[PDB]
Symmetry: D3
Subunit: 134 residues, 6 copies
């Protein structure tokens, strides 16, 4: 019975898929524990959230993107919520994300892929603290 | 061009209809300006919010219900947002709410009716400042 | 807190709208109290069910139709279930049934209109007894 | 058993609502008789199509809009299609179009309203001639 | 061309997912041959149905749950109905069930997983004769 | 950034699944480059289109099918469209096509499977030439 950190990304807002995305998690019975809306995320939280990636080439365009529009940060709660919401998520790569998954059905880009989801018990605690210090 | 305040009531959470409702508003092309998730709204906001209903016979049951579960406060923005989002909502009486409207399709009870939405300009400014001070 | 009698009509089965129809009643929170599936309704129950119409011109083609395919007979239960399920139903006439309603969204014919719904407290008791003698 | 002409406006394409719109009409049992897709329509057909509004203040802006993106021209067939696809359509004015209708659900602007539908019999032949000569 | 037996479990009724499930099967083009609504399935059918599970540590909780609410028994018919409807269903382990499948999209629990479906020819003939003698 | 050719087979029209199919592709962000609707396709284009199967036992029945009702020819554009719309498609064989895919969800037959999609780059130009010369 864990908690994971989801991010709804600015492309979700541009393409009006915010409810479609949250709806897939909702219909699988995961409950919202906490949720915050950001018209524009502070770049600092974004740099924090993606620190493991700071060395990568895409890290800068990634950060630009994440602040280019609103985002919603949600904490969901369920049994094995971390691994299950990741399988809903789908693969980052638009050439490997299966139909049925969020990214497989809706996304078509390596960078603008609608959603972020914690991928581990440690990833979650840390990301959740970043977005929900309280 | 206006802003209106929307409440997603506890029954929406119980029935897993949060996305369904927010999606109906999203497709009509309204923008989220602000949004806050309340695992349990403090009672004194609920009585503030419904302060014009305090002399009514249902008031106390309404407050009890508005704290029985989570709620989401949202400020929406758009052309004639106030009155357009009211029509989407549908009348309060389940015997009146039109099919096609959120309450018309989804609600079956005079109290537990999923959604709130400001009815006027002064009402919205008032309610927005309650949930978003 | 009443009970009403719904019929899902053979055209619903032909056009695969059975789940779509039952889904609209389900999403409005009315509960299934009883339900029976008929691969072909006995013409007698059909003649009974529509007795008030026995004098009409359409009564014969109506009966043919109702037995031309399967039908499901359901009893739903809710507050004011009778009047509410009728407003979901929509108007018999394809020139007056509003969008949003079952018939307004899905039906296009005076005869083959997908669904039947009791229209009164007396209509219901009687129809329910016809389809559910027990 | 009529026929009618239906346009899917550039805002549908912009908003990914093409199937959403066509699906509502398909769902009602109306059938595609013919259908062309235009990446960008000759402005002549547009001024032709909307010739009856040529005097209106909005005529020039409306046409600029109609050539701002792709459009799809469809002929639909079925009993009473013209008047029936017209109630599916809903009111031009976003203050009167009902929930349940394409515009009531999906449109929120006086000009950008996703769909056009023949309003009468002669309107229907008139416009079908324009798009499918 | 086969027949397979499907159970809509009590949790489907609790969550208002009956139509959602039946619709997923309906769209894959399978036909209802028989169907019965059980406001409360008699326990001895449930133990019959799950008779190969009687030595398992979950058996008693499974029976308790299979009578906690209504269920619908359905015989479906179609080409390779048995194995096609099994894939639609998805694995039992929520950690295994694929997105796109009924359990993959909708279920979150090893027990309360919405749906049953015969796994083989002998299994279906057996289960069909239980619910439809 | 590829292009690909997609056909909506007569069974889609028969089953009212045209928007359902096109919607899934639109939803994935692929764009219509051009699109013709055929009430009934010249059998020549069909034998052309399926020229590679001309020897197969099924070739004759498959073509009879492809002219049994209307079809819609679409060119789609987007990054990696060919291979991407191919996984949306799913397996020809109703015993291997996964839930989540058009065929896995909607098709239940080896011949009548709703949609065709170019399988390679040259296949794509090849077929686009046929339908849009
Ligand atoms: N060339 C790339 C690769 C990836 N990304 C972004 O970097 C994010 C995180 O990287 P990655 O780990 O590869 O994707 P995730 O699926 O989110 O996996 P995780 O965060 O758990 O590592 C992706 O969501 C994507 O938006 C990017 O902008 N450009
Ligand atoms: N010319 C007609 C008129 C109606 N009917 C059928 O008769 C049924 C019942 O008649 P009507 O009462 O007009 O329609 P309902 O909307 O079902 O209203 P109710 O049964 O409550 O009277 C309709 O559902 C329709 O299928 C028909 O076959 N041919
Ligand atoms: N008899 C009533 C009437 C209203 N109510 C609740 O009180 C709220 C305010 O009522 P209202 O008449 O202003 O209805 P709306 O403004 O929400 O349409 C409604 O949304 C209902 O949820 C109730 O519990 N019992
Ligand atoms: N004030 C207006 C009114 C309409 N229009 C556009 O012009 C079209 C013709 O208006 P109309 O009154 O015939 O509306 P419909 O026929 O589309 O219902 C509308 O569909 C709008 O797209 C506009 O640009 N500005
Ligand atoms: N550990 C378990 C395993 C199964 N079950 C239930 O027992 C049923 C039979 O289990 P199964 O392994 O045959 O799963 P399916 O055949 O339903 O895929 C499952 O559908 C579950 O609902 C349970 O309650 N606890
Ligand atoms: N045994 C078969 C196999 C395929 N077909 C049809 O012929 C088409 C070509 O088969 P294919 O193996 O290239 O399948 P896809 O390319 O469509 O995935 C299929 O889409 C079927 O419609 C058939 O009629 N009989
Ligand atoms: Mg009020
Ligand atoms: Mg007009
Ligand atoms: Mg088993
Ligand atoms: Mg091939």
């Amino acid at each position: 019975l864990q908690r994971t950190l989801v991010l709804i990304k600015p492309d979700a807002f541009e393409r009006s898929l915010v409810a479609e995305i949250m709806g897939r998690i909702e219909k699988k019975n995961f409950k919202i524990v906490s949720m915050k809306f950001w018209s524009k995320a502070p770049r600092n939280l974004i740099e924090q959230h993606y620190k493991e990636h700071s060395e990568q080439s895409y890290f800068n365009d990634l950060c630009d993107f994440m602040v280019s529009g609103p985002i919603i940060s949600i904490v969901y709660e369920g049994t094995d919520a971390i691994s299950k919401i990741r399988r809903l998520q789908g693969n980052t790569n638009p050439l490997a994300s299966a139909p049925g998954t969020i990214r497989g059905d809706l996304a078509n880009d390596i960078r603008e892929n609608l959603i972020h989801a914690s991928d581990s018990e440690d990833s979650a605690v840390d990301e959740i603290s970043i977005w929900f210090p309280e």
